[PDB]
Structure formats: structure tokens, C-alpha cells
Amino acid sequence: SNAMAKVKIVGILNVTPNSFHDGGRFVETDKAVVRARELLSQGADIIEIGGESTGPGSNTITADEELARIVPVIRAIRSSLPDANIAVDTYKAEVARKALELGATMINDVSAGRADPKLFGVVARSNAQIVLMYSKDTDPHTSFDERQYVDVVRTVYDFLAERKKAAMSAGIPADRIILDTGLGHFVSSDPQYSFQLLAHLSDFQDLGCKLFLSPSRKSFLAGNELLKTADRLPGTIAASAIAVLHGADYIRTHDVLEVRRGCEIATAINQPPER
């Protein structure tokens, strides 16, 4: 029949220790597992585990520290929740390699394969999907910068087409390549460009890949009131629903319950009558 599939909701699971010094890792691992269960309980389809933040102001960490953070978490989830689908947010080949050996089935590379020349190969030799994100910066840690564009849609489309080609040349087929236009500071600290990408998201379907976006209480949702993170849930729901309406196949979020429910409405609007 003509049934439109629901969007896949990607729950964000960031593993960041509280204590700066050594010790207290079992406690942090246990906390991450509890959060993973809650994400699944709220209806997340994929749990995206990351040990290194890449938003503005974020610190770079070594592959060893990154693995020390996520490995115990991945192992605990795969062991107790084997039904759960795990994605790993990393730009390092060594980290991706280990994550894939442990059962992760998706790698989300904020640098679209530019940070580590070996990452595409690692993904190619697995059956994992790769999410290629557009970023205005070469460095995987994005900057606060009010970048301007003549036409952001063209710039991002051209970048994603080139990264898709590069991934395919490295051995990853098109059916395992997912594209993310980026939103917020990854695109620009000037919010207009994020809204323009959302308006024209359907144009990206021509690249022949599933689409992944993360409005997720980002900067661009501040609006006229200059709303801070705590007040951006309605805007996050609206932007995520509109993204689904315009073609998003995956929505990444910290607010699984609410964003899943808002996106269900977008899917229902896109659902043609059963006749």
C-alpha cells in the first residue's frame, strides 16, 4: 500500500565525565546506560553515543580518552539491550573501528570524512551506514562565526555531493550514505541560513540519499526573543516536524518523547488517503 514510513528518532547520548581526574568511571557508565533505557522508553529508534562534543567551545580529546568513555557504554548497552541500534558520533577512524567491532551500525562524522583519511575505509569494510554532515569549518569542532553565503543551499548541496562521491570512491555504496545539511553554528552563527536549509530541504533528495537533521535546541531557534536552550523546545518541535515534512528520514534530538510526537503529526500530514 501507500503507507509513509515514520521518521527514525535518534536519541543523543553524550558521555562526559564530571570528575576531571581518574576514578568514578563505572558510575558514569551506569548513568549513561540509565539514560539509554530512558531514550528507548521514549521511543528512540537509534541511540547515538558520543564521547567528544563538537559544538562551539568544545574541547578536543584523544582517541584513547574517547574510547575510554564510550567503549564501556557501548558494551553495557549491547549486553543488556541487544535489540537497541547504536550509532557512534566520531570523526576518528580508530574510534569508529572499535565501535563497529562492538556492534555499532552507524557512524556520524561531523567532518564528512575530512578529519581522518582512514575513516571512510573503516566504514567501507563494515556494513555500517555513515552520516556525512556539512560544516563550514575544516576542524571538526565548529566555531562561533556569523558566516555569510551567496546561496547556502547551493554551497551545502555542492559540498554534500562531493563528500558522497568521495565516500563512494572509498568503497561505501550510496545506500549506506546518509546526508546532514548541518544546522545552527555548523552552518553559521547567523540563523537565517539554517531556516533556508529547512525551507529547501526537499532539494537535497536529488542526491539520492536518506536525510538526517538535528534542530535539537540549537542557536538558530533563539528567535526574536533570543530564547536560551531551556525555552527552545517548541521551536525544536516545529523545526523537526517541518524537516520531516520536507524529507528528513532521521531526526536527532535530546527530547525524544516530544519530538517523536511532533514528527508523527508531520508524517500523518504527508500520508495520502488509504483511498
Which residues are at the interface with K ion (CB under 5 A)?
A: 50, 89
3-state DSSP assignment of residue 244? helix
Closer residue to Cl ion, CB minimum distance, 157 or 250: 157
Specify the stretch interacting with its own copies by CB under 8 A; choose among 110-118, 123-131, 222-230, 255-263. Answer: 222-230
Q: Does 138 bind its own copies (CB under 8 A)?
A: no
Q: Kindly state the smallest distance separating residue 219's Cβ from its own copies, in Å.
A: 7
* H runs (alpha helix) in 89-141: 93-101, 119-124
Residue 2 vs 18, nearer CB to its own copies: 18
Residues from 225 through 244 that contact its own copies (CB under 8 A): 225-226, 228-230
Q: Annotate each residue in 8-47 with x if it binds its own copies (CB under 8 A) or - if it does not, as one string.
A: --------xxx-x---------------------------
Kindly report the backbone phi and psi dihedral angles of residue 79, in degrees, each rounded to the nearest multiple of 5, phi listed first: -70, -50
- The last residues before gaps in the chain (C-N over 2.5 Å) are none
Residue 103 as a binder of its own copies (CB under 8 A): the answer is: no
**136 touches, from Cl ion, K ion, its own copies, none (C-beta below 5 to 8 Å by class):** none
Neighbour count for residue 208 (Cβ, 10 Å): 11
Is residue 262 a contact point for its own copies (CB under 8 A)?
Answer: no
Which option in its own copies, K ion, Cl ion, none does residue 146 bind, with CB closer than 5 to 8 A by kind? its own copies
Tell me the C-alpha to C-alpha distance, in Å, between residue 148 and each of 57, 85, 151, 189: 20, 37, 9, 9
In the numeric block, the cell 557512524 is attached to 107
As measured in angstroms, the least distance from the Cβ of 188 to Cl ion is: 11
185 binds its own copies (CB under 8 A): yes
- Grid coordinates representing 209? 540519499
Contact 210, 250 (CB under 8 A): yes
For residue 87, the cross-strand partners are: 48, 106
User: What letter represents residue 249's amino acid?
Assistant: D
Which partner in K ion, Cl ion, its own copies, none is near 203 (CB below 5 to 8 A by kind)? none
Q: How far apart are CA 248 and CA 122, in angstroms?
A: 26
Q: Does 219 bind its own copies (CB under 8 A)?
A: yes
CA distance 215 to 183: 7
Contact footprint for Cl ion (CB under 5 A): 149-150
Q: By C-beta, is 138 or 224 nearer to Cl ion?
A: 138
CB of 222 vs its own copies, minimal distance in Å: 5
Burial class of residue 213, CB neighbours in 10 A (0-12, 13-18, 19+)? buried
Q: List the single partner that 50 binds among K ion, its own copies, Cl ion, none, CB under 5 to 8 Å by kind.
A: K ion
Pairing status of strand 129-133 against strand 250-253: unpaired
Can you give the binding site for its own copies, defined by CB under 8 A? 16-18, 20, 53, 55-59, 143-146, 185, 189-191, 219, 222, 224-226, 228-230
